[PDB]
Amino acid sequence: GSHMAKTVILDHDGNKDDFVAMILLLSNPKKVNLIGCICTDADCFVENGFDVTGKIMCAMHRLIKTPLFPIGKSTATAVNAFPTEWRFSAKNLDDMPFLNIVEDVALWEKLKPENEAHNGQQLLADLVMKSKEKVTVCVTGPLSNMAWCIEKYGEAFTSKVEECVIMGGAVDVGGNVFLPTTDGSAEWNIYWDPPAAKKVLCCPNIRCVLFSLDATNTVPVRSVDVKGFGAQNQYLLSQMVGTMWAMSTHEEILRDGDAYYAWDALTAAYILEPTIATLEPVALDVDVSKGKSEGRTPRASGPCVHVARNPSKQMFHDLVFASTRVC
Amino acid sequence: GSHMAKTVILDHDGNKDDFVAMILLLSNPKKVNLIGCICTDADCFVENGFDVTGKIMCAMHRLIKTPLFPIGKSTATAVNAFPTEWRFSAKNLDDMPFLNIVEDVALWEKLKPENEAHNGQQLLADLVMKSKEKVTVCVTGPLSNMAWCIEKYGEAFTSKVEECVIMGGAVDVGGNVFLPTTDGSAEWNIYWDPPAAKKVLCCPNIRCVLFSLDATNTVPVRSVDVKGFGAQNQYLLSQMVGTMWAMSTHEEILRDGDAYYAWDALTAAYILEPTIATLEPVALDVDVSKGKSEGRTPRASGPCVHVARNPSKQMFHDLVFASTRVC
Numbered sequence: 001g002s003h004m005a006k007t008v009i010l011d012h013d014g015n016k017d018d019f020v021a022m023i024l025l026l027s028n029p030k031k032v033n034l035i036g037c038i039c040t041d042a043d044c045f046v047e048n049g050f051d052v053t054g055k056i057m058c059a060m061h062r063l064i065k066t067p068l069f070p071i072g073k074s075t076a077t078a079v080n081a082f083p084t085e086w087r088f089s090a091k092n093l094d095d096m097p098f099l100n101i102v103e104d105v106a107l108w109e110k111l112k113p114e115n116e117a118h119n120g121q122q123l124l125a126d127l128v129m130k131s132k133e134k135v136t137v138c139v140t141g142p143l144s145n146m147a148w149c150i151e152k153y154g155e156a157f158t159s160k161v162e163e164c165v166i167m168g169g170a171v172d173v174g175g176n177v178f179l180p181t182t183d184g185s186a187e188w189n190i191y192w193d194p195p196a197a198k199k200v201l202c203c204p205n206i207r208c209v210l211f212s213l214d215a216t217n218t219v220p221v222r223s224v225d226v227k228g229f230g231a232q233n234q235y236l237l238s239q240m241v242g243t244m245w246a247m248s249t250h251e252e253i254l255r256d257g258d259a260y261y262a263w264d265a266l267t268a269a270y271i272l273e274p275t276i277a278t279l280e281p282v283a284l285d286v287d288v289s290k291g292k293s294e295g296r297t298p299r300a301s302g303p304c305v306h307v308a309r310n311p312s313k314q315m316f317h318d319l320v321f322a323s324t325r326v327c
Numbered sequence: 328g329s330h331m332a333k334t335v336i337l338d339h340d341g342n343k344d345d346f347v348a349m350i351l352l353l354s355n356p357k358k359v360n361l362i363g364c365i366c367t368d369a370d371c372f373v374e375n376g377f378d379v380t381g382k383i384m385c386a387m388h389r390l391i392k393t394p395l396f397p398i399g400k401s402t403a404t405a406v407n408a409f410p411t412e413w414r415f416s417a418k419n420l421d422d423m424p425f426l427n428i429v430e431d432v433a434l435w436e437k438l439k440p441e442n443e444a445h446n447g448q449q450l451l452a453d454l455v456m457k458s459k460e461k462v463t464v465c466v467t468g469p470l471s472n473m474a475w476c477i478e479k480y481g482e483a484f485t486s487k488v489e490e491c492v493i494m495g496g497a498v499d500v501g502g503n504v505f506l507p508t509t510d511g512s513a514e515w516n517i518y519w520d521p522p523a524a525k526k527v528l529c530c531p532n533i534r535c536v537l538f539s540l541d542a543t544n545t546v547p548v549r550s551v552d553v554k555g556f557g558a559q560n561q562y563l564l565s566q567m568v569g570t571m572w573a574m575s576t577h578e579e580i581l582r583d584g585d586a587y588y589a590w591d592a593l594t595a596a597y598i599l600e601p602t603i604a605t606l607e608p609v610a611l612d613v614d615v616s617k618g619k620s621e622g623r624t625p626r627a628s629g630p631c632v633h634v635a636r637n638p639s640k641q642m643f644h645d646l647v648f649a650s651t652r653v654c
């Protein structure tokens with residue numbers, strides 16, 4: 001819990017909570033050795049999500065001396081794109097004053113070209129396959145990169161994965177994909193690339209921990225708690241996380257307008273503290289059709305993954321607030 | 328320019344640039360004595376815009392010892408409401424870490440009840456009418472409060488106004504109100520309450536300086552300049568203004584996606600530096616109909632206001648960057 005670090009790669013798609021997840025992982029080097037990040041052109045414009053990833057890496061390196069690591073833009077493309085207005089969030093982040101501290105801009109400008117050479121899917125494969133320790137992959141965007149690696153390399157890749165902790169799906173609760181052509185039963189990360197999700201979630205060669213809407217619905221961050229970051233504004237990570245949650249737009253804001261979803265952050269929190277939730281083994285039948293139920297992750301007839309259940313609000317809160325006083 | 332301060336009231340509707348305007352005024356006490364603020368339930372939920380106003384007042388009082396002042400919620404209601412998603416911005420701001428510094432929250436919690444007793448329209452009238460100096464009113468929301476004061480008090484009020492510097496309208500360029508029932512010719516602040524605008528803009532008893540889209544269209548803040556606030560992140564006002572502009576959503580973001588509108592900020596900048604723009608006397612015929620042209624501010628047949636022209640991008644930039652190093 002403080003004596004040995006897990007080797008971790010973050011496979012993300014650049015929304016505000018992807019970066020909260022990144023900050024939780026990177027701010028806890030006693031627990032997590034972050035050896036790389038992948039960014040997918042899903043809930044962001046990949047150039048923006050890439051730059052924000054880079055600058056956060058640079059800021060942590062400067063402040064707390066966490067190692068620098070390779071970052072790769074995936075070339076995976078969507079089956080179903082995220083709404084364009086949502087994807088702009090990483091551009092907004094890239095313009096934020098806490099992501100434009102002069103040292104971080106200078107270091108990222110220097111490190112950017114070497115990272116631009118990487119292909120994200122290939123980087124994920126290379127980092128896992130060449131690692132001495134088995135690697136924990138945290139997936140907070142769609143499952144396309146994991147799918148590509150499993151398809152290209154099979155057990156040469158999956159044998160080197162410790163576990164895969166994924167944000168996606170909706171098992172016993174409704175989804176969050178509301179479009180003229182959908183029934184509302186699907187979750188967005190799955191919907192973006194349903195065949196990828198089908199390939200990964202039911203891959204018998206990896207241990208998947210799934211943070212579906214079942215778990216994420218129960219742990220919003222209330223406005224009253226987001227305001228708590230103000231007491232820590234002298235810490236860069238509090239300026240970052242407080243702003244990331246305060247910026248919530250569209251369906252990131254719950255019904256009552258006084259709380260926000262924290263989907264990916266809870267997912268990374270599990271890597272820091274596995275007791276934050278109980279796990280249930282579940283067989284899933286991923287809908288890859290073009291019907292209204294496309295992307296649905298219902299229980300199969302007759303396991304694929306271990307679904308997170310009843311996550312601890314207090315543990316989540318305490319972890320996030322401690323992590324964001326790190327620097 | 329540094330030897331005597333203008334007495335000013337800010338009559339605003341709580342969008343991000345309203346607060347940039349507020350920060351420009353309040354950060355320059357050599358030039359501006361801010362004696363009050365009004366908040367209207369237009370481009371915000373008035374409770375949120377009120378709280379943000381209060382906390383910014385409190386922060387400046389703490390940091391640079393600017394005086395505290397009365398703040399009043401207007402009870403004016405719209406003819407045509409702003410889009411609900413846009414109005415949430417002040418709620419997002421109210422949750423920001425730089426607007427939750429513990430001292431500011433404590434002081435605002437203390438000062439809030441006395442201010443809640445105020446009626447905004449009445450406060451605007453009282454502050455102008457009892458002021459020893461003639462008062463400059465900066466209006467960055469709709470014209471409803473000015474209209475109410477002129478209707479209730481006539482010259483007893485207008486004789487005590489130095490000038491009224493207003494953000495609104497579109498004279499020789501298109502508007503920004505795009506709805507199924509509009510032709511695109513109107514600007515939002517006017518559209519919100521066209522009869523109020525008609526009453527004020529052509530009131531022969533006040534000198535109106537109008538920052539219409541003609542002027543505001545030419546002074547966006549580019550992403551490259553918003554990023555400049557990062558170099559000043561140690562200053563609270565840079566964290567505020569940088570985030571306010573970086574947060575831009577919807578039609579605040581220009582076509583190319585690399586710049587944002589700064590409508591109200593330019594309007595306040597004129598109070599700080601009147602040479603920032605050239606003024607043209609223009610007679611206007613405000614459309615108060617329920618047709619597609621409702622809220623249009625075309626040139627009349629045959630002056631009402633002095634329209635701002637060709638504002639200086641460099642002066643605006645230099646003023647904003649200096650103001651946001653104040654604290």
Ligand SMILES: OC[C@@H]1[C@@H](O)[C@@H](O)CN1Cc1csc2c(O)ncnc12
Pocket residue numbers: 015016017018043086140141167176187188189249250251252253263264
């Ligand atoms: O399905 C949740 C996943 C998480 O991994 C978050 O990054 C948002 N992402 C998509 C998403 C669902 S609603 C919503 C929203 O309202 N804005 C931006 N993104 C989203």
Ligand SMILES: OC[C@@H]1[C@@H](O)[C@@H](O)CN1Cc1csc2c(O)ncnc12
Pocket residue numbers: 342343344345370413467468494503514515516576577578579580590591
């Ligand atoms: O017509 C411009 C006035 C200014 O006073 C700004 O506060 C925004 N306000 C309304 C407005 C126009 S487009 C737009 C937008 O996209 N988001 C929020 N507000 C607006």
Ligand SMILES: [Ca+2]
Pocket residue numbers: 012013014015017018043140141264
């Ligand atoms: Ca995500």
Ligand SMILES: [Ca+2]
Pocket residue numbers: 339340341342344345370467468591
């Ligand atoms: Ca305004």
Ligand code: NI
Pocket residue numbers: 001002003004
């Ligand atoms: Ni340990």
Ligand code: NI
Pocket residue numbers: 061
């Ligand atoms: Ni170094």
Ligand code: NI
Pocket residue numbers: 070118
């Ligand atoms: Ni490399």
Ligand code: NI
Pocket residue numbers: 085412577
């Ligand atoms: Ni929208």
Ligand code: NI
Pocket residue numbers: 076077078079144193196
């Ligand atoms: Ni695919």
Ligand code: NI
Pocket residue numbers: 228317321
């Ligand atoms: Ni707490």
Ligand code: NI
Pocket residue numbers: 328329330331
């Ligand atoms: Ni002077």
Ligand code: NI
Pocket residue numbers: 388
């Ligand atoms: Ni005091």
Ligand code: NI
Pocket residue numbers: 397445
């Ligand atoms: Ni009073």
Ligand code: NI
Pocket residue numbers: 403404405406471520523
């Ligand atoms: Ni009215």
Ligand code: NI
Pocket residue numbers: 555644648
């Ligand atoms: Ni400059």
